Amino acid sequence: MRKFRLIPYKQVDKVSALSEVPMGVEIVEAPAVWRASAKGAGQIIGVIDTGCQVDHPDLAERIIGGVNLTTDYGGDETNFSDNNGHGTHVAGTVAAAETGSGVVGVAPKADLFIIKALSGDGSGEMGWIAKAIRYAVDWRGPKGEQMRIITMSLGGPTDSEELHDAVKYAVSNNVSVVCAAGNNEFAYPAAYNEVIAVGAVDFDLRLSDTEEIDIVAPGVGIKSTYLDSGYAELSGTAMAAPHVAGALALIINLAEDAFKRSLSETEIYAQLVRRATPIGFTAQAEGNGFLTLDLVERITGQFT
Amino acid sequence: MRKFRLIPYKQVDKVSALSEVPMGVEIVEAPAVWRASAKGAGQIIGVIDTGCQVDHPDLAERIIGGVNLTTDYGGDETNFSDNNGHGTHVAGTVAAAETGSGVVGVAPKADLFIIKALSGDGSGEMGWIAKAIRYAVDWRGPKGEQMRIITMSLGGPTDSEELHDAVKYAVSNNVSVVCAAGNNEFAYPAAYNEVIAVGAVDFDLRLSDFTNTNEEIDIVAPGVGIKSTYLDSGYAELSGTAMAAPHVAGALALIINLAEDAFKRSLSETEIYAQLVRRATPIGFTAQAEGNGFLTLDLVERITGQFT
Ligand code: NA
Ligand code: NA
Description:
alpha/beta; identical protein binding (chain A); Rossmann fold; serine-type endopeptidase activity (chain A); homodimer; seven-stranded parallel β-sheet; about 20% strand; binds sodium ion; serine protease (chain A)
């Protein structure tokens, strides 16, 4: 393996068929805000991972492009197909489409831009990760479309100026950088102050497990898309982050519609924090709490 | 008056003696978080205003230093006494001490650093306001103390590089910059994206024409009939959009303490901002009118463990 790699996880199950809104999407309250958020239409998430099955039935209509920054496929930059499975799983939790079967993501009208920066074994060079971040920031679509969210479920032990500068470049250019905060060897980039660091809980809101986190989301028994047009149930710290990345698409639409202006990445971060409900551990352990997308509606007009 | 000046306000009453917790301190829920935040101990707020009555009895024990950046007192930099009143009133809302009498502020163990950047008439040169911001950022106490919060209740019509650079310098050096919204003669610095812009409601959480704003605001706090400290060891009741900002400046001292304890680590200006927004309860006005809501410091405790 190369130095930066996927935070370890467990495969619970693989199935060729599903038809449900996964419970993770349901208990972070995504369906409650879908109408007001237009399901994340108009936002694009750069998924920095192992690639994606581009013609997966739940995902094909949501992918707007991609790039391969790894040596895989002889270094062909137009081939971001998934030779691991993990990047396909991430993509589904973010933005699997409503198709009448399979699964549905947190933001089922957001667009995905697939950045394969990990090789088939789930590892990559620090420089690949730094370049993936800068690429995401700098990319422009045909009509000047850009990404405002990037998500990673990876870490490496080394603090390098190249990688930290990339993260600074992203947030200074109003891109939210989501990384899973997991188990030292996986410290960076999640440890950087600029990053929205996500921890995991199970569906009973118990912590999965010094990490400096901002928020928790579902990470146990998470069903999503996988290779060969089928599905897999994974459990790990890194299963949480993709929920937050889809949530950000919904929240930027919610907040900018409310405020009637463009909001900075600082302000978007506050709007995410706004929508976290403490479970009742300490903030050192759960950050701001559990992602609860409809919280603002519930507190409105509620006075002492 | 000069170009940059205090945002207009009314003096409703002026008394010699008072004994209460002003309602604004109450309704923002500051007492509910005092224990957890050690009443703002260890935090210093830079009050950029007309000076302060440095021996006021509600204030003298809270004040740790000052500077005068104006031409008042023939430019004596060590004379930051208040020749207007408004600075004293602000200082009181932020951090008036617990005494058995008088008033008490939102953060009654927070320290004040008094920066006189406005003249007796409540106006100042943009340059003085720029310098005041940088001054607060660069200042270090006898043991290396720093300010992490500055507050202003002023505005002027002109955007300039100098003033915006000062604001950015603060925020990039983790200093929260709080600004009252103007009631656009009073557009800057409150219109800078980097600043926390605060609007006003009254004690029924209602809007009023005199306190309304067209500024892009982040939060609202009480601004109508706010009793605080004033000249000659007395008290005054002021109404005005700018009455709200000091409630937020004090609140930040409480927030920084309680959130850095909760997280068990130092938090950036960005993170402190989120900590503030997460303690705003929407009242039902538009986001233009109220930003993220009304300052309710105990909100995080109220929502804890509450899932649908
Ligand atoms: Na589907
Ligand atoms: Na007192």
